[PDB]
Write a protein that binds this ligand. Sequence first.
Ligand SMILES: *[B-](O)(O)[C@@H](C)NC(=O)c1ccccc1Cc1ccccc1
Ligand SMILES: *[B-](O)(O)[C@@H](C)NC(=O)c1ccccc1Cc1ccccc1
Ligand SMILES: [Cl-]
Ligand SMILES: [Cl-]
Ligand SMILES: [Cl-]
Ligand SMILES: [Cl-]
Ligand SMILES: [Cl-]
Ligand SMILES: [Cl-]
Ligand SMILES: [Cl-]
Ligand SMILES: [Cl-]
Ligand SMILES: [Cl-]
Ligand SMILES: [Cl-]
Ligand SMILES: [Cl-]
Ligand SMILES: [Cl-]
Ligand SMILES: [Cl-]
Ligand SMILES: [Cl-]
Ligand SMILES: [Cl-]
Ligand SMILES: [Cl-]
Ligand SMILES: [Cl-]
Ligand SMILES: [Cl-]
Ligand SMILES: [Cl-]
Ligand SMILES: [Cl-]
Ligand SMILES: [Cl-]
Ligand SMILES: [Cl-]
Ligand SMILES: [Cl-]
Ligand SMILES: [Cl-]
Ligand SMILES: [Cl-]
Ligand SMILES: [Cl-]
Ligand SMILES: [Cl-]
Ligand SMILES: [Cl-]
Ligand SMILES: [Cl-]
Ligand SMILES: [Cl-]
Ligand SMILES: [Cl-]
Ligand SMILES: [Cl-]
Ligand SMILES: [Cl-]
Ligand SMILES: [Cl-]
Ligand SMILES: [Cl-]
Ligand SMILES: [Cl-]
Ligand SMILES: [Cl-]
Ligand SMILES: [Cl-]
Ligand SMILES: [Cl-]
Ligand SMILES: [Cl-]
Ligand SMILES: [Cl-]
Ligand SMILES: [Cl-]
Ligand SMILES: [Cl-]
Ligand SMILES: [Cl-]
Ligand code: NA
Ligand code: NA
Lengths: 468, 468
Amino acid sequence: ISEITYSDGTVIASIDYLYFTTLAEAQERMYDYLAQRDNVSAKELKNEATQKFYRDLAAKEIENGGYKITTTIDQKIHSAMQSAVADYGYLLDDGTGRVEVGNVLMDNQTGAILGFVGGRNYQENQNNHAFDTKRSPASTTKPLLAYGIAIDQGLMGSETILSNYPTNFANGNPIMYANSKGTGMMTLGEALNYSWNIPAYWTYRMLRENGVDVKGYMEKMGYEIPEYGIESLPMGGGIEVTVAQHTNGYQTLANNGVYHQKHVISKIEAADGRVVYEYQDKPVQVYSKATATIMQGLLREVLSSRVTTTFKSNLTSLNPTLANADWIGKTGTTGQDENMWLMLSTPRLTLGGWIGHDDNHSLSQQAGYSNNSNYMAHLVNAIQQASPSIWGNERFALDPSVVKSEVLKSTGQKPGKVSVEGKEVEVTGSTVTSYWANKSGAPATSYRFAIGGSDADYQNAWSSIVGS
Amino acid sequence: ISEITYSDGTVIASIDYLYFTTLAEAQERMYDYLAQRDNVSAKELKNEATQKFYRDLAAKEIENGGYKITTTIDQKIHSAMQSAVADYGYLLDDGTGRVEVGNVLMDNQTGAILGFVGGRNYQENQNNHAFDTKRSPASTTKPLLAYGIAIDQGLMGSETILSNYPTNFANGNPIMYANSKGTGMMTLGEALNYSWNIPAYWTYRMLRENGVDVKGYMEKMGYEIPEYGIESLPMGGGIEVTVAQHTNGYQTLANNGVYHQKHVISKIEAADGRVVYEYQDKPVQVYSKATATIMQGLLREVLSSRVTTTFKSNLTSLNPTLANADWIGKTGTTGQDENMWLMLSTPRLTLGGWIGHDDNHSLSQQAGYSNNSNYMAHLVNAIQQASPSIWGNERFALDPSVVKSEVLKSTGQKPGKVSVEGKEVEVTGSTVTSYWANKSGAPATSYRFAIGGSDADYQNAWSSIVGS
Ligand SMILES: *[B-](O)(O)[C@@H](C)NC(=O)c1ccccc1Cc1ccccc1
Ligand SMILES: *[B-](O)(O)[C@@H](C)NC(=O)c1ccccc1Cc1ccccc1
Ligand SMILES: [Cl-]
Ligand SMILES: [Cl-]
Ligand SMILES: [Cl-]
Ligand SMILES: [Cl-]
Ligand SMILES: [Cl-]
Ligand SMILES: [Cl-]
Ligand SMILES: [Cl-]
Ligand SMILES: [Cl-]
Ligand SMILES: [Cl-]
Ligand SMILES: [Cl-]
Ligand SMILES: [Cl-]
Ligand SMILES: [Cl-]
Ligand SMILES: [Cl-]
Ligand SMILES: [Cl-]
Ligand SMILES: [Cl-]
Ligand SMILES: [Cl-]
Ligand SMILES: [Cl-]
Ligand SMILES: [Cl-]
Ligand SMILES: [Cl-]
Ligand SMILES: [Cl-]
Ligand SMILES: [Cl-]
Ligand SMILES: [Cl-]
Ligand SMILES: [Cl-]
Ligand SMILES: [Cl-]
Ligand SMILES: [Cl-]
Ligand SMILES: [Cl-]
Ligand SMILES: [Cl-]
Ligand SMILES: [Cl-]
Ligand SMILES: [Cl-]
Ligand SMILES: [Cl-]
Ligand SMILES: [Cl-]
Ligand SMILES: [Cl-]
Ligand SMILES: [Cl-]
Ligand SMILES: [Cl-]
Ligand SMILES: [Cl-]
Ligand SMILES: [Cl-]
Ligand SMILES: [Cl-]
Ligand SMILES: [Cl-]
Ligand SMILES: [Cl-]
Ligand SMILES: [Cl-]
Ligand SMILES: [Cl-]
Ligand SMILES: [Cl-]
Ligand SMILES: [Cl-]
Ligand SMILES: [Cl-]
Ligand code: NA
Ligand code: NA
């Protein structure tokens, strides 16, 4: 009798989302193992008939064998997450029909998956929203693919200024944020807290212009994106992900820039104890520790600001002590409200969350801001009541390698002479600490001080500043 | 006394659009000449003050000198084009306010510019729409940047099938053609004649997927495009051009794939006869002769089909004998009707044409289809009445190197066994000659026979075909 087990070895089942997800993954491990065992090359595995046979053999091998498949799943925590979706699932329903949901709770030090929600109720709808459904991750792409990489590359600090003035995509359409064609200059923090789009667009433009290897970063974390030239990439255009994959992206940021590959299987043993597969840790430093910890600091304010999510309010009411753990995170909303995301970390754990409809019809405007935030607050609470120390009380903290520059609030760059329409001008004014992940820190102030912006934009902004 | 002259040496003027365009270009030649004459490096020319001085010196040098600046402009033809815009300009006005216009008539063998229209009336509006205004070239980008390059690369023949089924951009928006989300499979000819967008989008996707050096082509013709990853690049997203530059793109196609750099100055001589600048021909084979001549054949049908332009009807009425020259061309329309283009070639000459408003407000829906077509028909007529043999009576003809494959109408690929949902199936049916620019011609028919298309798309199309 083969058995799928929780991480402590309690038996899940002899050989619902949990069963079928872990069994499908075990079948894939068994496939690789049998193929190598029989000396079938990946040249021969190119053959559909050979491949099919080996898939069948893998499945029957588990059925008939006496294998012990040890998963990473924590019984108590995964059972708490099931009861939480059962009990509080209905908080998602927002007047647009029944809302579907996926969640993945991941250990930031190992990438092990401790439990997950695959959906509202397997018995009514079997689609697995944690591992199978691929969806645009919307604005939760920004910290990873735009600002994170900019910061990593010495192209941006914590208090850098970005343009949020009006501007068009290549196709001539305006870049929108709900009904706003935009505003003016803003700090990176404000851009993150509001999730404005134009500042993200300019950041990614800057990366392209500099020929930064964005793919090198994203592929290290296991993302597959077919076109890196897409302008709205940081807003979720041209990227689709499962919740488990995307959680692994936030795991990397939470773990001080060090990726660990997600997994639900830690080991498969034959009846006699032969280890036929075992997870092998392959840690990767995807962002510098300076970058990661700078980003942790920005993402803490995302949640504490409560601009795009009610989550910290919902949590503080449910569980004030837990709300005082060091929560960081980012929300996402797709352009027609088709996908809402909330990704959450403490230094120990990352919990990813998606809601949406299976046929891609729209959620209500506030599904992500309010409903998912409340559901995920109840989820988080449930996890903690199951395993009181699991989230931890550690804080995220800036790595010793972070560089601190004193920069003008108004420019995000150092006080200096700047040439402004003819005149060289002493740019002076009140300053602020800005965090950087390069060697030298922030540049001296320049005329084009901000990330992006047209000539008109700068004339408007300099006029403004020049009122000293 | 310095003098700007027509190509025969008749004096234009001692030292309006014509005057200022040729004088500005002469100033730039004089700038390079004086800088080299004084041994100022391009390192020193990096200095703004040195640069400014040298620009001033160039201008004063012409003023005070005795230089003879010989332009490529044909007096009679350029004077006919002025009278044509004066007399028939008003045909552009379409109920959206006064419409602006730019035209450039180019010799396909030399790239010499024989005359141009800079606008409706210099005296009312000085903007130079032939040489200065940069605008999206819309769907006239397709032959150059999508199908041309696909054909060049052995990825497409004259009767290849493309998908025009419904599909979304990376941002999740549908690809539109006016109010159509699209249709089904279609030939390359139909795609060109209608200017459908989805088939163009898939072609460019295919290029990106294959890592084709699209930039290598476009830069050879002197285009500057900042982001080659833009999905709507073939529809004019992310590209802006002057009329003179874009004419040079159609010159390359008309001249059997061989680029000649556009120019309005052929020579500058000092009073004593010293040749201080002279145009130097640097011909480049940008597309194979097979490709170019295949494309000539497709673009002839664009005009003869009269789907997107009334031009051949307007011309046949004005001048039936001239309408029977071998006209090929492409129209362009931007998404809000802001820019309309019509590019025209005979084997001898290429005439480019743009209309639009200076502040970018919309034209009427039919400004490009009807009004510009009629204006340009009158322009063409005027040019011919000035210089009766200038357009020539030669035909475009397929180069001996073009490969001819007999392919199924339905697939654009060769008759063959194809695996269709289980069954291998004998795909048979009526065939057609398809032109190719590779060594081997069209592949055998495959399941995914068309450029682009989803799994659903192919199921719909194969079902259809399978009705033998
Ligand atoms: B992102 O925050 O997911 C970003 C790309 N989202 C939007 O632009 C969006 C989609 C749908 C409705 C509104 C918005 C803007 C918005 C407004 C308030 C908070 C977050 C996003
Ligand atoms: B192309 O033909 O310039 C292409 C990208 N144009 C359009 O999609 C367009 C823009 C504005 C209005 C309509 C259309 C579609 C269209 C309809 C008939 C003929 C040509 C273009
Ligand atoms: Cl499942
Ligand atoms: Cl489950
Ligand atoms: Cl066996
Ligand atoms: Cl356990
Ligand atoms: Cl996954
Ligand atoms: Cl858009
Ligand atoms: Cl990249
Ligand atoms: Cl992915
Ligand atoms: Cl790329
Ligand atoms: Cl696994
Ligand atoms: Cl996994
Ligand atoms: Cl055994
Ligand atoms: Cl580091
Ligand atoms: Cl808070
Ligand atoms: Cl709140
Ligand atoms: Cl649904
Ligand atoms: Cl609760
Ligand atoms: Cl420091
Ligand atoms: Cl400092
Ligand atoms: Cl540095
Ligand atoms: Cl920038
Ligand atoms: Cl500007
Ligand atoms: Cl001019
Ligand atoms: Cl003129
Ligand atoms: Cl001199
Ligand atoms: Cl002349
Ligand atoms: Cl030009
Ligand atoms: Cl769009
Ligand atoms: Cl390219
Ligand atoms: Cl250009
Ligand atoms: Cl590129
Ligand atoms: Cl020139
Ligand atoms: Cl020129
Ligand atoms: Cl002289
Ligand atoms: Cl050739
Ligand atoms: Cl005709
Ligand atoms: Cl007609
Ligand atoms: Cl105007
Ligand atoms: Cl006429
Ligand atoms: Cl042949
Ligand atoms: Cl053949
Ligand atoms: Cl070949
Ligand atoms: Cl394809
Ligand atoms: Cl499909
Ligand atoms: Na958001
Ligand atoms: Na058109």
